Amino acid sequence: VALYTVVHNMSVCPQRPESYCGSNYCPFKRVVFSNCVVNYTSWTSGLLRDYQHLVLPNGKFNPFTECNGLNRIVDDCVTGFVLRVGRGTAVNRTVITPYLKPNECFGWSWNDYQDSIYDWWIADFVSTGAFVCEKNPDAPRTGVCITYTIEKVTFQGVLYESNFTFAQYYNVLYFGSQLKYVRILGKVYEVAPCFEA
Amino acid sequence: CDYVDFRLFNGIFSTSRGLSNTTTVITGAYPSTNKAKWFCPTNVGRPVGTGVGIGVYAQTAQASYETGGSGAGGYTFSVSPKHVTNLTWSLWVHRPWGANANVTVRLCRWWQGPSSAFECLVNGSFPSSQHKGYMFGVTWYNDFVRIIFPPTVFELQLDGLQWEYVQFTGPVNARMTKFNVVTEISSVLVLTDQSGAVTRYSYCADGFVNGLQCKLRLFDIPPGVYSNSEVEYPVALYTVVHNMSVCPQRPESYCGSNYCPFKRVVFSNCVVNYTSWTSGLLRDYQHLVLPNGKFNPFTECNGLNRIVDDCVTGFVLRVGRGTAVNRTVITPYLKPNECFGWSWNDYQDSIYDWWIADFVSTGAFVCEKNPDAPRTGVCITYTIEKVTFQGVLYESNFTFAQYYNVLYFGSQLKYVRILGKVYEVAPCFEASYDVLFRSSSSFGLLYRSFDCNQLRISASRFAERLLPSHNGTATALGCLFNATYAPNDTMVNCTNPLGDGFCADLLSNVVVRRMTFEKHDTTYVAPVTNERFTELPLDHQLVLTEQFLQTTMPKFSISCET
Amino acid sequence: YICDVSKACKNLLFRYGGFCQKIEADIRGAGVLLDSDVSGLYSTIAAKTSSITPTTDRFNVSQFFLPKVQSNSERFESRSVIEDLLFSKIETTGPGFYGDYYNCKKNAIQDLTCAQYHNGILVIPPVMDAETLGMYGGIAAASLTLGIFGGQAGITTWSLAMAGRLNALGVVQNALVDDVNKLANGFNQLTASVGKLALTTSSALQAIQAVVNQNAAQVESLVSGITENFGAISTNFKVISQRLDKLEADVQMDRLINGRMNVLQLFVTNYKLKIAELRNTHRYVQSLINECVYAQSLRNGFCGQGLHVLSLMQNAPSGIMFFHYSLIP
Amino acid sequence: LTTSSALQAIQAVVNQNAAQVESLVSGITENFGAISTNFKVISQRLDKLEADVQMDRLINGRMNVLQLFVTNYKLKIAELRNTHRYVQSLINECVYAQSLRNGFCGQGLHVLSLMQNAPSGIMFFHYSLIP
Ligand SMILES: *[C@@H]1O[C@H](CO)[C@@H](O[C@@H]2O[C@H](CO)[C@@H](O)[C@H](O)[C@H]2NC(C)=O)[C@H](O)[C@H]1NC(C)=O
Ligand SMILES: *[C@@H]1O[C@H](CO)[C@@H](O[C@@H]2O[C@H](CO)[C@@H](O)[C@H](O)[C@H]2NC(C)=O)[C@H](O)[C@H]1NC(C)=O
Ligand SMILES: *[C@@H]1O[C@H](CO)[C@@H](O[C@@H]2O[C@H](CO)[C@@H](O)[C@H](O)[C@H]2NC(C)=O)[C@H](O)[C@H]1NC(C)=O
Ligand SMILES: *[C@@H]1O[C@H](CO)[C@@H](O[C@@H]2O[C@H](CO)[C@@H](O)[C@H](O)[C@H]2NC(C)=O)[C@H](O)[C@H]1NC(C)=O
Ligand SMILES: *[C@@H]1O[C@H](CO)[C@@H](O[C@@H]2O[C@H](CO)[C@@H](O)[C@H](O)[C@H]2NC(C)=O)[C@H](O)[C@H]1NC(C)=O
Ligand SMILES: *[C@@H]1O[C@H](CO)[C@@H](O[C@@H]2O[C@H](CO)[C@@H](O)[C@H](O)[C@H]2NC(C)=O)[C@H](O)[C@H]1NC(C)=O
Ligand SMILES: *[C@@H]1O[C@H](CO)[C@@H](O)[C@H](O)[C@H]1NC(C)=O
Ligand SMILES: *[C@@H]1O[C@H](CO)[C@@H](O)[C@H](O)[C@H]1NC(C)=O
Ligand SMILES: *[C@@H]1O[C@H](CO)[C@@H](O)[C@H](O)[C@H]1NC(C)=O
Ligand SMILES: *[C@@H]1O[C@H](CO)[C@@H](O)[C@H](O)[C@H]1NC(C)=O
Ligand SMILES: *[C@@H]1O[C@H](CO)[C@@H](O)[C@H](O)[C@H]1NC(C)=O
Ligand SMILES: *[C@@H]1O[C@H](CO)[C@@H](O)[C@H](O)[C@H]1NC(C)=O
Ligand SMILES: *[C@@H]1O[C@H](CO)[C@@H](O)[C@H](O)[C@H]1NC(C)=O
Ligand SMILES: *[C@@H]1O[C@H](CO)[C@@H](O)[C@H](O)[C@H]1NC(C)=O
Ligand SMILES: *[C@@H]1O[C@H](CO)[C@@H](O)[C@H](O)[C@H]1NC(C)=O
């Protein structure tokens, strides 16, 4: 198998909004994450003792501790989200999960551990059509039969490099109801049937 | 506007997938093909145009070979709700004067296009096309923002946005950037080329023939008989049909001397004033005002829509009182089918009232107004007692039992009761018609379920329903309009059958004739038992008759897990 | 039928794997097969008469099988006396849309349309529609004489035609006037006994009622498919999206769309199942017209048991009734 | 094609076969309301309750299309059982013999009948003398 959540290159994501509210009470700072490549461990300070609770058993950083309607474990690509940040104080080392609306995920790491100060972030996954991944896609292996998934549609077949051109707004091209051409990383591939299945 | 380039519409149409040489219907918020809906006046200054709707589109003028040089056009425009406060989101889009200019797009909350805002979701600058004519747009139908500067499309759903009001300016050069505010959702038939790009469109509602083009997925319609074109009629919802009295008051939140449980009151079968649940001073409830200026009782729901659109089911309401630390009211744990809201009680001391509404099964409804009497004698798609039906209401002297609001005969809805008065439900027979089509300038109409005798269409019963096309010929096939009806002529060669032994002759003009069949003979000869006359043939015609019979199919093997 | 005026529902229909394209291709192709069969039937029915009409002497065939002559009233009737009795002995199915449809076909009022439209569904007549025609009149008239007078005309009377038929069946060598009158009395008593057929005793009236009862049960299914809510809070789509949140509005709209898809799909399957039966029923019907009605057959038991004298045919509700006359010992 | 009712009967079979094939092609292209047609995608992005709701939407959507194909295929087989008995009677009695049955090999006095293969079936050519 070969999944493509996206087929083009994405640029990097913005930074996490800063949690320090200046002099008074202020509302939170929202930033849209969409169509970009994200480094989730940039959202912490970087010292291991601040984010140990976010490390998965396989040694991987995970941004979230609790979700409503989604999987808290992030497997390399999610949809686009709106991210808001804030800051609190834990009593007896216990961060309380707040009320989560549907399609929201919560996470936190220590900011000033001795003073029990933490940053938190809530990601609200709204309809965007775009995706946030942790890496860019690769070029396909041509000339072998693979079960692909491209543009939410699964098909079994063989890709060959092609000199065909179709319009730049599309990433797949149909002839009637038959998938004939796809575009991956700017290059166009003819979809051929694997007759020996 | 004087000239809108309608060949630039091809670049803003797209399908979901890439389709080679196909013909398909797409649907969405699209620019009007009526040139009077566009805005491009030349004057001494830059004129400010406004509009109300769901979107906007724009075309820049042809820059190459126009004696312009470098000045192009700025097209500053903003989109906003009906009541702009500190708390509402708005859009601001600006291009500066000159070529190689960057469009700036800003979706922010401004306290005052201003420089400083509280926060922004889109704060972006990017290059644009100026070497040719260029078309772009921004739509916000059902709060789904779509920013279409081709080739890229930026999309974002933002609930409760409620954008409706559009303002736009443009500096006159030499012309001006043209503007069209979109008011409604359209269907468009499109034709693609080999590469999937749209090369031919046609809007489904620009005319009579255009609707038939979209029904058949064809641009060039050959002559024929095309059945079941339908007429759309407006809607009328009745969540209730009787008058309700007023609701009780909100329970008071002041607990007397000690700790006490909350006070519950049932709201059911009544008319509610939600802004009575606050103190009435605006600074206490500003967070409950929607962007359209409307009061909304709730800030958070579990399983329901927090925006209340004029009627909900009955609920049990409990109140209470708390203290906010650093002006932050915390939403508590909400059981399913519950909604939460709050307003300030003593703002300086940070004291607030709250209320939780638990929508339990009651069978009854809480509305913000009483229903109205129906408009009789027009075909409306009604919804009454959770059942949707299309039809016509007439006042009636019929009586049925007071426990019921609808009355069925078998499975047919015959009578309803609205505000104590009983109405007969009648069918609107003119909702469906066929087209007896020669070309775009010669067609006839057949209303197959409509008996249009002159007594019926002249009555006061049919006064509000009479269109000019209902004055046709009453046939056994229905009402035939602007076709001639000739049931004494015959045709043995019928290419266009209508049913019931009728045929449509579509050669010169639209005529309805009768079908016939060629009479055959038999080979059985009766025996000759006495002297009489008999009829013998003189010669014979040799005849070839063909007969097809299907005998085979391919076999299938199915792996249903695969 | 699914999404009555709701534009929000129509934007959701593309998700289902070509449902609405496949429905409209199946119901249209089935009517093409229906029109192809009914057209072949009426080119078989249409047949030449003699230019001199023979006289029925004592055989009362014109009073029963031939269209009723227009009386002193401007109410034209195309049906015979037998064809009227077959429409009027079929029981009603009660109030509703189909009972309104049957009574329009039964009453046969001139220039009155019987087509109905409900909820996106048009009821169109077929290419000929037997239910408004008399068998032995009209443009596509059947021959009354072709199977006992034959295809070479000249036999002057029904008494001379029946005498030759009794001779060819080997029961009388040369039929006298008492032999032919005995056959004319037995014909007229049997034909008058058709007007006393009850539904409880007649297996031909029972076969018509079974068709009429299956049509009403199918119509109630389409009426119930847009009346009930399948578990959603309303049949109004805009109501559903306004009162619920996004997850529960998408669950309940999926309940309405699938509930209406299942009822509509079941109608198309039953309609295709009835077309497929009628392909080989029509070939059987064309053989009865060609070999029993318009000729004299040699096949034992094919036109009834016994020695075959005459066969006639009449229109019925949704079909044709064959009247076979035989001599059994 | 516009004038020949035998060519029209062949085209009706060929048009019904294409419409059935598009139904099987569309049944694995569309997502029936789920977020993807990839099952591993669905279980990775959603929680346990919503992953089981959306997988049930794909499985039932594909089950309905596949089941409809088998029903239509069985409906066509059941028609062809009694069509074959009619076809065997035309070969035995019109093509390989001389029949006595009025109108069974066409109307009129029967001279000759021949048969040819067609797309998905057989075409009979009946030659007759009518006066
Ligand atoms: C993702 O973010 C982490 C956290 O900042 C980056 O790790 C740091 O990278 C810099 C390189 O400029 C090093 O000097 C630091 O020692 C790294 N660790 C910490 C804790 O700051 C990392 O480079 C980013 N990118 C990737 C691909 O992981
Ligand atoms: C909308 O926001 C403006 C600016 O944030 C508010 O104006 C301030 O009002 C306070 C009094 O409430 C003054 O002390 C400040 O000097 C004002 N200006 C600024 C720049 O802060 C305004 O009151 C708000 N309006 C509403 C209705 O909330
Ligand atoms: C939106 O973007 C503009 C720049 O594209 C921001 O303007 C800058 O803001 C910073 C911080 O206040 C100033 O130091 C710069 O002088 C500004 N101008 C520039 C870079 O030309 C603007 O602040 C952004 N808006 C928000 C709400 O962040
Ligand atoms: C709904 O409740 C509001 C809030 O009390 C009512 O508004 C007040 O009406 C009285 C009339 O007796 C006025 O004197 C007040 O000035 C109004 N405003 C406030 C803030 O108290 C309103 O009348 C009620 N009814 C409707 C239909 O809105
Ligand atoms: C429908 O059309 C008919 C035919 O034009 C109208 O009947 C004519 O009405 C006029 C009144 O202006 C009379 O003077 C004529 O004698 C009528 N008969 C003809 C012209 O043959 C009828 O009025 C129209 N009805 C409606 C409701 O539009
Ligand atoms: C067959 O038709 C003849 C027509 O001549 C019928 O005979 C007449 O019937 C009417 C109706 O009852 C009587 O009033 C006449 O007295 C009859 N006349 C003669 C000469 O018979 C006859 O009744 C018909 N037979 C059947 C069984 O319907
Ligand atoms: C916190 O810890 C102290 C002692 O460590 C304990 O007495 C107290 O109950 C804990 N909880 C809170 C909410 O203070
Ligand atoms: C594509 O174009 C190049 C350049 O002419 C050619 O060498 C090659 O054969 C073409 N086809 C493919 C499949 O690469
Ligand atoms: C996509 O990203 C990779 C990252 O290394 C880069 O090397 C490549 O040039 C980019 N563009 C294309 C078209 O692959
Ligand atoms: C305009 O955009 C280009 C490309 O994004 C950028 O290099 C340039 O600095 C921008 N100039 C201004 C004035 O915004
Ligand atoms: C369809 O595309 C083909 C090439 O794939 C080309 O002949 C032409 O552009 C189109 N032809 C027709 C008949 O639409
Ligand atoms: C409230 O505000 C003060 C200063 O304004 C701040 O120090 C404190 O962390 C805030 N939060 C709480 C829970 O007290
Ligand atoms: C109802 O009754 C009144 C009073 O007799 C009468 O005038 C009217 O015609 C009746 N029918 C309708 C439909 O109002
Ligand atoms: C219903 O309420 C309206 C409110 O103005 C009132 O005028 C009317 O009399 C009431 N009753 C009926 C039967 O409409
Ligand atoms: C029957 O009509 C069609 C179309 O009008 C025509 O092409 C054909 O030649 C006609 N045939 C006869 C025999 O009239």
Residue numbers in the entry:
A (entry chain A): 265 to 461
B (entry chain C): 17 to 128, 142 to 203, 205 to 592
C (entry chain B): 593 to 921
D (entry chain C): 791 to 921
Show sentences the authors wrote.
The spike glycoprotein of coronaviruses mediates viral entry by binding host receptor with the S1 subunit and fusing viral and cellular membranes with the S2 subunit, thereby determining viral host range and tissue tropism. As a class I viral fusion protein, the spike exists on the envelope of virion as a homotrimer and each monomer contains more than 1000 amino acid residues that can be cleaved into S1 and S2 subunits. In this study, we report the cryo-EM structures of the SADS-CoV and HKU2 spike trimers at 2.83 and 2.38 Å resolution, respectively. The overall structures of HKU2 and SADS-CoV spikes we determined here resemble the previously reported prefusion structures of coronaviruses spikes. Both spike trimers have a mushroom-like shape (~150 Å in height and ~115 Å in width), consisting of a cap mainly formed by β-sheets of the S1 subunit, a central stalk mainly formed by α-helices of the S2 subunit, and a root formed by twisted β-sheets and loops of the S2 subunit.
The HKU2 spike trimer structure is the first one from bat coronavirus. The atomic-resolution density map enabled us to build nearly all residues of HKU2 spike ectodomains (residues 17–995) except for a few breaks (residues 129–141 and 203–205), as well as 48 N-linked glycans and 71 water molecules. The NTD of HKU2 has three layers of antiparallel β-sheet with the top one consisting of six strands, the middle one consisting of five strands, and the bottom one consisting of three strands. The CTD of HKU2 has a twisted five-stranded antiparallel β-sheet as the core with connecting loops between the strands. Interestingly, the CTD core of HKU2 is of high structural similarity with the conserved CTD core of β-coronaviruses and the disulfide bonds in the CTD of HKU2 except for C285–C290 are also detected in all β-coronavirus CTDs. The HKU2 S1 subunit, similar to those in α-coronaviruses HCoV-NL63, HCoV-229E, and PEDV and δ-coronavirus PdCoV, has an inward CTD that contacts with the NTD. The FP and CR, which are often not well and totally resolved in other coronavirus spike structures, can be clearly modeled in the HKU2 spike due to the atomic resolution of the map. In HKU2, the second helix is replaced by a short strand (713–716) and the third helix is replaced by a loop (721–741), therefore there are two short strands and only one helix in HKU2 CR. The S2′ cleavage site (between R671 and S672) is then covered by the reversed CR helix and loops, and R671 interacts with E723 in the loop and K697 and K698 in helix 1. The buried S2′ site indicates that HKU2 spike, compared with other coronavirus spikes, would require more conformational changes around the S2′ site for the exposure.
